Amino acid sequence: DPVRQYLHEIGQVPLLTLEEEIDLARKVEEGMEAIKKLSEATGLDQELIREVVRAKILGTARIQKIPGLKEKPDPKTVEEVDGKLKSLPKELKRYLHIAREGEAARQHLIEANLRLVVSIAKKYTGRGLSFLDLIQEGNQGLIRAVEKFEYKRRFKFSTYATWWIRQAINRAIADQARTIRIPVHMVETINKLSRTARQLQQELGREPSYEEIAEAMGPGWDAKRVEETLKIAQEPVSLETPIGDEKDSFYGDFIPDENLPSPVEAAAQSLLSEELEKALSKLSEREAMVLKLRKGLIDGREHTLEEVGAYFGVTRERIRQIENKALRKLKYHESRTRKLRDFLE
Amino acid sequence: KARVYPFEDDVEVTTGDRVAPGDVLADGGKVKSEIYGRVEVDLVRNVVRVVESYDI
DNA sequence: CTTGACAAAAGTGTTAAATTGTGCTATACT
């Protein structure tokens, strides 16, 4: 059981007393301001030196080689900035150390409040997303809450954290739970719809109609709109969904293929092309060529008027008269043979 | 569990890396760690701590 | 086979509406 594993793993790392909390926050902010001061030192960006320090902290070679096969070279752009930051006087140096310690503090803080996140994610199940996924989204929301936190406001970090964890988990339901992608706006919309529907179903004693629920939704809401949003809200169906009491049948294998031509269809198209080819041959050579230039029987494209006139060297009007005439001659011979009178669907 | 090494002038080593007995600690070769272990540079006490562990 | 005159159809470039993606909130809460 993975849940047991992770829960025990975070059960290992203890909580944090107010002293520890405030001290860690302090050390973090000191670290960041140290990074900024180092940005005024060597003249490089904050996140640059930050990610370098991380690369010296949360693992040696493992931060670089696998966030995908290509990021920032190990011996080259990492180590040269490292050595460049190495070559500074005493104050900037002590600030380097301070920065590193800040990073570590950030990590620990993150852990205790991972326990917190686990509580919050424990609140949110039923999703359309699994428990551990909830935990992890909440954990990212936790790293996020840690980054922007300010201890000077003298508030317990737990509250600020909770808000961020919650919003992160909601970002999960919005971005995940449904097989098809439904963006945030209509997710919230659907939620409001269902909520209100529940409310007036409680009131009226029965399910509503699109009209009354639309009116209960306020302005801009009609029957068609709630019907449409409800049409989007519905989920796909599993192809493996069992049909009947039989164990030999699925739902998906009862689905026909209209994308693929049936033998009768291929034969139909064949006979059409052939019979049309033979019914074409009784025309004059030029008019037939013109026709099959118009139809796409040559390159598949449609050569207009002027194009045909350009290829045969004549005017476009002549081409027009030509094709009309062809059409009527085919009218005669087809009025006779009745071979092509079909294919009329 | 550790061995303490107070310094004076800056430091060569940084928090978290690896040192072997005889390797150079702070003050330009003034103090060396005689023991295998991870090294932590402490600002407040102005000291270099070597906690014995193997880099494994 | 030809030409010129015309509108309907299909194009082409700037704008408005709605659409979607991203971030944020501080009693405390593990």
From Swiss-Prot, chain A:
Residues 305-324 bind DNA. One of its GO terms (molecular function) is sigma factor activity. It is found in: Cytoplasm. Residues 1-35 are annotated as: Sigma-70 factor domain-1. The keyword Mitochondrion does not apply. Keywords: Cytoplasm, DNA-binding, Sigma factor, Transcription, Transcription regulation. GO terms for biological process: DNA-templated transcription initiation. Residues 188-266 are annotated as: Sigma-70 factor domain-3. It comes from the Bacteria. Residues 279-331 are annotated as: Sigma-70 factor domain-4. One of its GO terms (cellular component) is cytoplasm. A motif (Interaction with polymerase core subunit RpoC) lies at residues 133-136. Residues 109-179 are annotated as: Sigma-70 factor domain-2. Belongs to the sigma-70 factor family. RpoD/SigA subfamily. Contains 4 domains, connected by flexible linkers. In the active conformation, the domains are in an extended conformation, each making extensive interactions with the RNA polymerase catalytic core. In the autoinhibited state, sigma-70 factor domain-1 packs closely together with sigma-70 factor domains-2 and -4, contrary to the extended conformation that is seen when the protein is part of the RNA polymerase holoenzyme. Interacts transiently with the RNA polymerase catalytic core formed by RpoA, RpoB, RpoC and RpoZ (2 alpha, 1 beta, 1 beta' and 1 omega subunit) to form the RNA polymerase holoenzyme that can initiate transcription. Sigma factors are initiation factors that promote the attachment of RNA polymerase to specific initiation sites and are then released. This sigma factor is the primary sigma factor during exponential growth. This is RNA polymerase sigma factor SigA. The chain holds residues 94 to 438 of 438 of the full protein.
From Swiss-Prot, chain B:
This is DNA-directed RNA polymerase subunit beta'. The RNAP catalytic core consists of 2 alpha, 1 beta, 1 beta' and 1 omega subunit. When a sigma factor is associated with the core the holoenzyme is formed, which can initiate transcription. The gene is rpoC. DNA-dependent RNA polymerase catalyzes the transcription of DNA into RNA using the four ribonucleoside triphosphates as substrates. It comes from the Bacteria. Belongs to the RNA polymerase beta' chain family. It comes from Thermus aquaticus.
